[PDB]
């Protein structure tokens, strides 16, 4: 049936991707993840790599097998998806992992774990969340006068992400202080780095 | 009204001297004079939800 070999083709070590607390590309989430990216780059410089991917990566098992049903609607799905660039980015991830240096992915399209599960990447999911929806709403209001038009979609994304089961996520960063979350992520990063070394 | 029959007669007499004068005889020529006013119609943004 499945006949799945144990030796599934995966990168040398699992890539790390950050999700939450809202839609990526919006101001609050962008700043929240930018701070963590800067901390990770500065603290662990020398053996840590950062990779940015522009094209969508959520299509890796279905609609990628040249399936007649779903490979037709790939050019008019409001995304730069011509399959070839997806494969090129997958090979890029594999070759970057082959260097045996810990790498992270800045997936501007990924905003939910369940859309990156059936893929063969099997990455590391880092969850950063706000304790209350009211706090997130107040932060959005205080950020500026431009995100008011996009408040509803951000709240929808936040509440949709809340319902995700904890087992889907690998680590949780729900500490109010920036330093606490930074150290919590750094300890896991160092543990994983020592595990493969 | 005071008397229904009086009003009926008055309206009958008033209506008898009215004749049709169509107001759409030369609408096309008036339309063709200038381009349509497509200015100030694609401003703002399409509404997403309530409020």
């Amino acid at each position: 049936a499945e006949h799945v070999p144990p030796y599934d083709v995966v990168p040398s070590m699992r890539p790390v991707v950050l999700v939450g607390p809202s839609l990526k590309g919006y101001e609050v989430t962008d700043m929240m993840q930018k701070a963590l990216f800067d901390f990770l780059k500065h603290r662990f410089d020398g053996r840590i790599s950062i990779t940015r991917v522009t094209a969508d990566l959520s299509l890796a098992k279905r609609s990628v097998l040249n399936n007649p049903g779903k490979r037709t609607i790939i050019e008019r799905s409001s995304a730069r998806s011509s399959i070839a660039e997806v494969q090129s980015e997958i090979e890029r991830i594999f070759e970057l992992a082959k260097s045996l240096q810990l790498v992270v992915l800045d997936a501007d399209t990924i905003n939910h774990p369940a859309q990156l599960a059936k893929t063969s990447l099997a990455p590391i999911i880092v969850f950063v969340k706000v304790s209350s929806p009211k706090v997130l709403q107040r932060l959005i209001r205080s950020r500026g006068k431009s995100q008011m038009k996009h408040l509803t979609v951000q709240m929808m994304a936040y509440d949709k992400l809340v319902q995700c089961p904890p087992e889907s996520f690998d680590v949780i960063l729900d500490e109010n202080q920036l330093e606490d979350a930074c150290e919590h992520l750094a300890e896991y990063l160092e543990v994983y780095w020592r595990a493969t070394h | 009204p005071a008397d229904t029959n009086k009003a009926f007669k008055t309206e009958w007499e008033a209506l008898e001297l009215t004749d049709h004068q169509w107001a759409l005889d030369d609408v096309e020529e008036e339309l063709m004079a200038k381009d349509l006013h497509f200015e100030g119609m694609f401003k703002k943004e399409l509404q997403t939800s309530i409020f």
Binding site: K134 | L24, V27, L31, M32, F38
Partner: protein
């Protein structure tokens, strides 16, 4: 909904409900969502504005298949106003929403017996007739009601729609003329009358359709349906093999101008938002339908 995906005061909710009341919108879900919260958490804030909200929320909840809120609102309204006639109409609507038509019929007959010059009961009886699929009886009763009470535009529009659904277009055109006579400044009636005349018959009907499409486009310059109809009618009349040369060239000129305006409008649309999918497509439609 306040502090829940939105940040609005109770005044804003009241204004939104009023605006939804002015124009006959039938988005029952949002109306129920706002109304239940307004009733629950801000009942005392509204001095005397809660009764019309009660009626609107009850109607929306009946439309939304949620009868507990409808019963609650009906109980509140009946307690506030004892023996009123609008509350009886709401009760009849609730009865007929549960497929209990005999009780609603007897209730409306009682209402008419108490007051013979009432209008809503007759309309609800016509709605009951329509709900069972009995189209001819509904048309006859609506004709009788219009004979009794002339000057009611909702009934005229409903009769026009019913005649349209039965593929009888001359009487629908007559009703649309009656509606257009009272409201000569509304382009929607002209557009619909032009569509009916287009669908009705042949050459002179097409000429009238083109005339009224032009009139509708003159009244409002943003009506894309009127422009498309004008272009289509001009092209259809131009190619008719039973027309004189003068009419043929006039219709060709009209079609050329309409096509130019359509192309300019689509270029304007494509300038703002970048999709470039119809500007490459409407041109093919114009070219393949030329002459």
């Amino acid at each position: 909904k306040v502090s829940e995906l939105y940040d609005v005061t109770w005044e804003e909710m009241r204004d939104k409900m009023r605006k939804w009341r002015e124009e006959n919108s039938r988005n029952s879900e949002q109306i129920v969502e706002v109304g239940e919260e307004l009733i629950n958490e801000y009942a005392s804030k509204l001095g005397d504005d809660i009764w019309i909200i009660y009626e609107q929320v009850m109607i929306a909840a009946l439309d939304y298949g949620r009868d507990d809120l409808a019963l609650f609102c009906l109980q509140e309204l009946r307690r506030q106003f004892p023996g009123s006639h609008r509350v009886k109409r709401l009760t009849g609507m609730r009865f007929e929403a549960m497929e209990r038509y005999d009780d609603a019929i007897q209730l409306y007959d009682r209402i008419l017996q108490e007051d013979p010059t009432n209008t809503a009961a007759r309309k609800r009886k016509i709605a009951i007739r329509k709900a069972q699929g009995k189209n001819v009886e509904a048309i006859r009763e609506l004709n009788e009601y219009l004979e009794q009470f002339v000057g009611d535009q909702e009934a005229w529009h409903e009769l026009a729609e019913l005649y349209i659904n039965e593929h009888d277009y001359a009487k629908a055109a007559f009703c649309l003329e009656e509606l257009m006579m009272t409201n000569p400044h509304n382009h929607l009636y002209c557009q619909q009358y032009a569509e009916v005349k287009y669908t009705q018959g042949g050459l002179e009907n097409l000429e009238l359709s083109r005339k009224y499409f032009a009139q509708a486009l003159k009244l409002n310059n943003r009506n894309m349906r009127a422009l498309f109809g004008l272009y289509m009618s001009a092209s259809h009349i131009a190619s008719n093999p039973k027309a004189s040369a003068k009419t043929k060239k006039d219709n060709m000129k009209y079609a050329s101008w309409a096509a130019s305006q359509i192309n300019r409008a689509y270029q304007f649309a494509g300038r703002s938002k970048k999709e470039t999918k119809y500007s490459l497509k409407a041109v093919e439609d114009m070219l393949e339908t030329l002459q």
